[PDB]
Design a protein around this ligand. Structure first.
Ligand SMILES: CCCCCCCCCCCCCCCCCC(=O)OC[C@H](COP(=O)([O-])OCC(O)COP(=O)([O-])OC[C@@H](COC(=O)CCCCCCCCCCCCCCCCC)OC(=O)CCCCCCCCCCCCCCCCC)OC(=O)CCCCCCCCCCCCCCCCC
Ligand SMILES: CCCCCCCCCCCCCCCCCC(=O)OC[C@H](COP(=O)([O-])OCC(O)COP(=O)([O-])OC[C@@H](COC(=O)CCCCCCCCCCCCCCCCC)OC(=O)CCCCCCCCCCCCCCCCC)OC(=O)CCCCCCCCCCCCCCCCC
Ligand SMILES: CCCCCCCCCCCCCCCCCC(=O)OC[C@H](COP(=O)(O)OCCN)OC(=O)CCCCCCCCCCCCCCCCC
Ligand SMILES: CCCCCCCCCCCCCCCCCC(=O)OC[C@H](COP(=O)(O)OCCN)OC(=O)CCCCCCCCCCCCCCCCC
Ligand SMILES: CCCCCCCCCCCCCCCCCC(=O)OC[C@H](COP(=O)(O)OCCN)OC(=O)CCCCCCCCCCCCCCCCC
Ligand SMILES: CCCCCCCCCCCCCCCCCC(=O)OC[C@H](COP(=O)(O)OCCN)OC(=O)CCCCCCCCCCCCCCCCC
Ligand SMILES: CCCCCCCCCCCCCCCCCC(=O)OC[C@H](COP(=O)(O)OCCN)OC(=O)CCCCCCCCCCCCCCCCC
Ligand code: HEC
Ligand code: HEM
Ligand code: HEM
Ligand SMILES: COC(=O)N(OC)c1ccccc1COc1ccn(-c2ccc(Cl)cc2)n1
Ligand SMILES: COC(=O)N(OC)c1ccccc1COc1ccn(-c2ccc(Cl)cc2)n1
Lengths: 29, 49, 60, 242, 49, 385, 49, 70, 96, 48, 70, 48
């Protein structure tokens, strides 16, 4: 409801990591 | 916000089909904020109850 | 036609696999097209590369 | 009619095409025509020694080609100049000391810089080929000065450069017969690379993005005709006749 | 800067690195020691960079 | 206001973007000729972004300027893309604006109540010409020197002050390092004036809205900008980027001159001094007068008869769809601006001295035979009835 | 992918040029001084302590 | 500023009930004949004075070139 | 006030070391910025760790950006607030 | 010696920070690549 | 946005019926005493910690200078 | 030329400047030479 709001909302945190290394490959860190 | 004169939700059943919706009566300068509120709360039933 | 409901069945009913698919699908597609341009190139030009120089090692 | 020159024909160069590359064994041979026939009076001065590595020569061959020249180096602790053998970072050497000493050894005329000479005239690859292999005998009624030669492709008809590509002027290290037309074709492929050293990184990036952009054009014409279909098919009754 | 510091070492008044002459830091935020490259004699005193 | 909140696009932080870029009412029959105005605002942003990165590697000095442009082409990562996008991108910015202007002449978009929209755009066309000319000098080749000499000395035919004008513009007795350094400072500044004059030119159109292909009062059939004219403007930004990519990757030197690859020498003259293709029509009018002070005085009536089109009145029909005679004069003026561009790259000799004197006359007979249909035409409803 | 190509091409042109990387390794000499003193000599763009 | 009082009846379908693409290659012979039998005096006014001037210049330059030859 | 800095004292607010051309082999004896960067230069050199020095400049611009989001204060002006008024003159003595 | 003290202060950031400073500098030190890009940004930032 | 309904009566004179300048040097002894007997705890909080810190530094530096002298 | 009108007359500087030899650019043979100084020249350098 409100759990499914965040249980969705933290995988856009991760859709954004599939995206955050998609072009830059930030390497050393 | 006084954006209508009256509002009513309906639900009709038939042998094979049906109809589910909302009926409203309003003044011609309120139709944007009324249509936002109707569609916002019907779609919220699929997300957050 | 049954693959069309089944592919919408699983992934995009929300923004889960939408702003992640389009990113990760931008990669497999960019590597599928960079591979085909890089093999149509070395098939139109045989005998013209740098490693096809017969006297390469030997200047002296 | 001899005021702009004669018009040169069109030759099928091996790097002309939408997916065609340089012949790298012909760039290798054309650097040898340059360094033995041409570098005595012409400069390049934009090309370094490190720019041939991976194009026509190995890094070990350039570290022994560059160490055969003496290059001026900066002041020592006593405040004097000296000379040193060349390195990978150095530019191609200059035949003269300035433009004034270059006209004096050539009858007043200046021999230009050749690092961009295929881009600097119109039709610049078919012009350098047809000029070097184009020294003819003058027609009936034309006289030339002393120290000037008749080339019909030069604008004016009288050039201050003598004919320099004669048969067998270079010993090719790969068993190619060094004919006049062979050395002329090989030195233009070297000079084409020197003006445009980016042409292969450029034709490969342009095939990837014209193809990818004609897919986004098919998506955007569907997206347009889908949002406009409720308007383009609606029915309307109005009450008016004429 | 040489010829100064809490030892006589390499005074750096940039943000306050007080070295010792050995090169390893005494008091300051320099996260490493100084870089150590490779060099040895030929015969006598010229050791090559 | 309302008592509690609603759609967030109707909040004060995003009202100016909502009512002018999303909900703005648009005529429903606009064609693809109404698409070249947002295309010209993308061409201006490309020139600003590409030029800011080009200026991190350029040196404005006569001993160092030609060799800084070859250093970008050869030693900077992707630097040949940064130059070819900027040199060919100034040709795309002029193709798009030239097709913009000829839309407004066919459908008579300068007419009432839209006179201030026309006059703010004649100022924009003047700032574009000064910016492209002043920026063609920084590469410092043989055509960057002998083109700045031919144009800046043309102010030496203005009466008594004249010769004090040219030596103040030059900073000396010729084109030299004082001239190359001040042409660089003005070239970073003038694109940012061009930005503020384009936002002002759009506030004048959002006071009355847009014209339409029929020319009529259109407030009874209007839709919103999003999504309808956004998705058909997006078809135009992708068809443009294909056409722009056949000029960067497959023909990057077709639209230039070879003489700008020779470094600048003030002792010899090139055989033929020709400008870029988009300055060729005003270059043929400027060389058509056999007096020089009457040549500067034929360029200023080009920008006077442009600025004085929307102030003739009696014309109630706007669109050329319903006007069969003025429609045939439009296609006969377009054939004249393409013939004046051909003449401007030819030698000054026979026969191009007669064929270059009649089209400057035909070009000025377009702006005098417009208002006479503003008199003969208003007696049509009393005769054809 | 088009936003991927453009942003990387603008940001990578600021990194380091091919002529800067060609001056990054070489061999130079020094002279002699007495125990406990200081003299420096240059290598690429910075000293040798 | 934007109000015209009106009276009309409109009907409309849904986007996902129609055929989006096939209305482009529908009657392209009929579509081509309509555009060129209605815009043939606007191209005779655009290309006409350009083909006729290019013919004059090429004839002028081919008679002063054959008059300078000995 | 601006004309007593152009005509009668044009070099008081600068450093003399910027009249020596740049030499990367020697260091100046004291590296001091312009007067208007001196307060953040003393916070940056106050931390004896360097990575904690960059991390003391970013909380200067975080506690500035997060002043207007504390709420319960109905009196605004320091004319009617005698205790917060004395803290204002005690912060100004600290930035100097 | 003020552009050296400040731009090297980004070399204490975790382990992408040694790639930050040599991208800001354009090389291994403050030199002509740094003076040329500091001039281009200085004409731009007053208009923002 | 800007309306408060009100009830008041105002009277006003003309600018060219009054004396514009002489109300500056009117009672300057009385004006000075009002400002300094009401703002003397805001200057004891601004100059106080600065005079007391400058006294500490000059005393610290005058006792490590006389301890290094032979 | 910067001392003219400050401490010296123009005739005195045209005889002070002509006592030094200044290097001038290449002749038609492409060689350097020396010439006496002028009003436009800078003060001479003691070292190389
Ligand atoms: C004869 C040719 C027949 C083809 C259709 C008409 C056409 O393209 O003629 C030119 C047409 C007008 O000519 P017309 O013969 O009077 O035809 C009337 C049109 O129906 C004018 O009506 P419209 O403008 O609404 O066009 C309807 C549209 C219908 O198409 C759709 O349904 C749209 C969906 C996309 C699919 C395509 O058909 C098209 O014209 C296709 C799109 C063409 C525009 C391309 C986008 C920008 C142009 C270049 C950008 C910058 C470079 O010009 C334009 O539509 C505007 C500019 C396009 C040309 C610019 C460059 C050429 C100079
Ligand atoms: C908006 C409308 C603008 C149209 C765009 C025109 C353009 O892009 O440049 C024409 C383009 C410019 O090339 P160009 O090398 O600068 O021509 C001048 C040379 O000096 C060669 O000079 P030329 O004596 O051989 O004759 C020049 C002739 C083409 O050269 C010839 O081959 C002679 C045959 C005629 O092309 C012209 O430059 C006349 C057009 C004048 C530009 C009109 C600007 C006014 C806009 C209103 O002329 C060409 O025909 C080259 C072929 C590329 C055409 C496809 C471009 C599609 C756009
Ligand atoms: C402001 C952000 C600057 C990002 C940056 O550090 O520049 C990238 C820099 C370039 O160096 P590099 O790309 O490795 O050299 C060419 C090899 N492809 O070096 C890098 O690639 C660093 C990659 C990590 C970037 C994360 C920092 C944001
Ligand atoms: C080359 C292009 C020149 C530049 C012209 C720019 C502005 C002209 C313009 O706006 O054209 C619109 C008009 C459309 O034609 P129209 O008869 O009004 O539409 C009938 C539909 N029922 O005019 C047209 O007919 C456009 C047709 C394309 C014109 C070039 C093709 C001629 C060959
Ligand atoms: C070189 C030059 C550099 C200059 C730089 C300046 C940058 C230009 C930016 C524009 C600044 C002016 C803001 C314009 C915004 C605007 O005009 O608002 C639209 C206006 C609103 O309509 P309205 O119904 O009257 O709203 C009132 C609410 N009761 O709708 C209108 O009525 C528009 C009125 C016409 C104004 C233009 C004529
Ligand atoms: C106890 C606080 C904890 C510390 C502060 C938070 C952490 C510090 C990080 C700094 C950034 C602050 C971000 C907070 C901004 C949004 C906070 C907010 O909305 O406050 C709510 C306030 C009243 O809230 P109310 O409408 O009554 O409903 C709440 C009932 N549950 O209504 C509002 O204030 C919203 C209306 C004004 C907002 C307009 C924008 C103000 C600036 C916010 C952006 C932050 C600064 C970024 C720079 C902006 C410019 C680019
Ligand atoms: C817990 C500590 C208690 C602090 C408050 C104790 C004194 C109460 C107080 O605030 O008195 C008000 C005081 C002076 O009040 P006032 O008469 O207006 O000033 C005379 C000058 N005209 O106003 C003040 O002097 C306040 C000074 C600020 C306090 C300094 C420390 C913060
Ligand atoms: C005898 C010394 C000498 C030799 C060797 C030499 N050149 Fe030249 N070159 C000149 C001179 C002098 C000119 C100037 C001609 C003129 O100004 O008319 C010139 C001009 C040229 C030009 C310019 C033609 C033009 O239209 O401007 C080209 C291209 C050229 N040379 C190429 C070459 C090539 C390729 C070679 C190697 C086969 C070569 N040169 C060898 C002296 C030389
Ligand atoms: C802030 C904005 C801009 C900056 C900083 C800028 C910067 C530069 C620089 C540094 C050059 C020289 C490098 C080179 O020759 O390629 C140049 C050239 C040039 N600029 Fe710009 N530019 C800007 C905007 C524009 C605009 C808006 C236009 C056109 C309307 C324009 C037109 C040109 C042209 C035509 C050249 C000549 C390039 C060539 O032919 O080689 N510039 N610009
Ligand atoms: C930097 C250059 C320019 C920009 C960014 C620009 C921008 C725009 C935009 C976005 C529109 C609305 C969209 C459209 O109608 O296509 C418009 C309309 C218009 N513009 Fe431009 N423009 C520029 C140059 C010019 C010039 C040079 C002229 C005329 C000499 C001009 C005159 C007009 C006119 C008359 C309209 C009328 C709108 C209509 O007919 O409905 N603009 N402009
Ligand atoms: C991109 O620039 C060129 O092509 N340039 O300039 C180096 C060039 C090169 C060679 C020959 C001529 C020119 C210039 O041609 C023209 C023709 C008319 N104007 C003009 C310029 C400014 C103003 Cl206010 C008014 C009129 N300029
Ligand atoms: C006018 O400039 C000077 O006085 N400069 O710079 C050459 C100088 C000269 C000598 C020593 C130090 C500086 C710089 O001092 C400071 C202190 C803090 N910042 C700073 C700068 C940028 C950012 Cl984002 C954040 C903090 N800079």
């Amino acid at each position: 409801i409100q759990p499914t709001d965040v249980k969705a909302a933290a995988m856009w945190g991760v859709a954004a990591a599939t995206g955050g290394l998609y072009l830059i490959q930030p390497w050393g860190w | 916000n006084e954006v209508a004169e009256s509002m009513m939700a309906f639900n009709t059943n038939y042998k094979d089909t049906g109809l589910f919706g909302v009926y409203a009566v309003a003044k011609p300068d309120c139709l944007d904020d009324l249509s936002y509120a109707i569609m916002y709360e019907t779609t919220k039933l699929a997300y957050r109850v | 036609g049954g693959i069309f409901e089944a592919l919408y069945k699983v992934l995009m009913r929300r923004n889960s696999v939408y702003v992640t698919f389009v990113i990760a699908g931008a990669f497999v597609g960019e590597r599928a097209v960079d591979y085909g341009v890089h093999k149509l190139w070395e098939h139109n030009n045989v005998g013209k590369r740098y490693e096809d120089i017969s006297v390469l090692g030997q200047r002296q | 009619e001899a005021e702009h020159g004669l018009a040169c024909p069109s030759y099928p160069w091996p790097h002309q095409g939408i997916l065609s590359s340089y012949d790298h064994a012909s760039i290798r041979r054309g650097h040898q025509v340059y360094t033995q026939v041409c570098a005595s009076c012409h400069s390049m001065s934009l090309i370094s020694y490190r720019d041939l590595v991976g194009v026509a020569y190995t890094e070990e061959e350039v570290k022994a080609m560059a160490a055969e020249i003496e290059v001026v180096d900066g002041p020592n602790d006593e405040g004097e100049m000296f000379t040193r053998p060349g390195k990978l970072s150095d530019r191609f050497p200059q035949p003269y000391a300035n433009e004034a000493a270059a006209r004096f050894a050539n009858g007043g005329a200046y021999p230009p810089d050749l690092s961009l000479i295929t881009k600097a005239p119109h039709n610049g690859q078919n012009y350098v080929f047809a000029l070097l292999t184009g020294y003819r005998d003058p027609p009936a009624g034309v006289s030339i000065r002393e120290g000037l030669h008749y080339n019909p492709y030069f604008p004016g008809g009288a050039i201050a450069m003598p004919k320099m590509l004669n048969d067998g002027a270079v010993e090719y290290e790969d068993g190619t017969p060094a004919t006049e037309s062979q050395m002329g074709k090989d030195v233009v492929s070297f000079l084409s690379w020197a003006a445009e050293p980016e042409m292969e990184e450029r034709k490969l990036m342009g095939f990837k993005w014209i193809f990818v952009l004609t897919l986004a054009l098919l998506q955007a014409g569907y997206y347009r005709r889908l949002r406009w279909s409720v308007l383009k098919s609606r029915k309307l009754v109005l009450d008016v006749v004429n | 800067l040489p010829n100064a510091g809490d030892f006589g070492g390499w005074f750096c008044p940039c943000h306050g690195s007080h070295y010792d002459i050995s090169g390893r830091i005494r008091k300051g935020p320099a996260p490493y020691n100084l870089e150590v490259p490779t060099y040895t004699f030929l015969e006598e005193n010229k050791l090559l960079i | 206001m309302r008592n509690q909140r609603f759609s967030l696009l109707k909040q004060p932080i995003s009202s100016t973007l909502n009512q002018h870029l999303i909900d703005y009412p648009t005529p429903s029959n606009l064609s693809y000729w109404w698409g070249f105005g947002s295309l010209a605002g993308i061409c201006l942003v490309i020139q600003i972004v590409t030029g800011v990165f080009l200026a991190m590697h350029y040196t404005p000095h006569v001993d160092l300027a030609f060799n800084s442009v070859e250093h970008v082409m050869r030693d900077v990562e992707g630097g040949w893309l940064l130059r070819y996008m900027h040199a060919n991108g100034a040709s795309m910015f002029l193709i798009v604006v030239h097709l913009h202007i000829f839309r407004g002449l066919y459908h008579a978009s300068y007419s009432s109540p839209r006179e201030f929209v026309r006059c703010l755009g004649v100022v924009i066309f003047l700032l574009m010409i000064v910016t492209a000319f002043t920026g063609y000098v920084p590469p410092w080749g043989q055509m960057s020197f002998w083109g700045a000499t031919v144009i800046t000395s043309l102010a030496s035919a203005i009466p008594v002050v004249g010769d004090t004008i040219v030596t103040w513009l030059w900073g000396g007795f010729s084109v030299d390092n004082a001239t190359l350094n001040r042409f660089f400072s003005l070239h970073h500044l003038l694109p940012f004036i061009l930005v503020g004059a384009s936002l002002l030119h759009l506030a004048a159109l959002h006071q009355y809205g847009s014209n339409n292909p029929l020319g009529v009062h259109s407030e009874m059939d209007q839709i919103s900008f999003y999504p309808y004219f956004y998705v058909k403007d997006l078809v135009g930004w992708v068809a443009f980027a294909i056409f722009f990519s056949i000029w960067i990757f497959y023909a990057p030197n077709v639209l230039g001159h070879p003489d700008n690859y020779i470094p600048a020498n003030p002792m010899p003259t090139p055989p033929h001094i020709v400008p870029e293709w988009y300055f060729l029509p005003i270059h043929a009018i400027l060389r058509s007068i056999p007096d020089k002070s009457g040549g500067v005085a034929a360029i200023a009536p080009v920008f006077i008869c442009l600025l004085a089109l929307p102030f003739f009145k009696s014309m109630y029909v706007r669109s050329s769809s319903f006007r069969p005679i003025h429609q045939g004069i439009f296609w006969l003026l377009l054939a004249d601006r393409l013939l004046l561009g051909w003449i401007g790259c030819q030698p000054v000799e026979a026969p191009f001295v007669t064929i270059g004197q009649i089209p400057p006359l035909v070009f000025f007979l377009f702006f005098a035979i417009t208002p006479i249909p503003g008199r003969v035409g208003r007696g049509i409803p009393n005769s054809y009835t | 992918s088009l936003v991927r190509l453009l942003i990387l091409k603008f940001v990578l042109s600021m990194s380091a040029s091919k002529d800067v990387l060609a001056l990054a390794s070489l061999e130079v000499d020094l002279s002699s001084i007495e125990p406990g003193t200081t003299v420096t000599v240059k290598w690429r763009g910075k000293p040798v302590f | 500023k934007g109000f015209v009082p009106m009276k009309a009846v409109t009907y409309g379908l849904s986007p996902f009930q129609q055929k989006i693409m096939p209305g482009l290659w529908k009657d392209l012979p009929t579509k081509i004949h309509h555009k060129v039998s209605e815009n043939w005096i606007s191209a005779t006014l655009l290309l006409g004075p350009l083909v006729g001037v290019y013919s004059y210049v090429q004839n002028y330059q081919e008679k002063e070139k054959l008059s300078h030859r000995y």
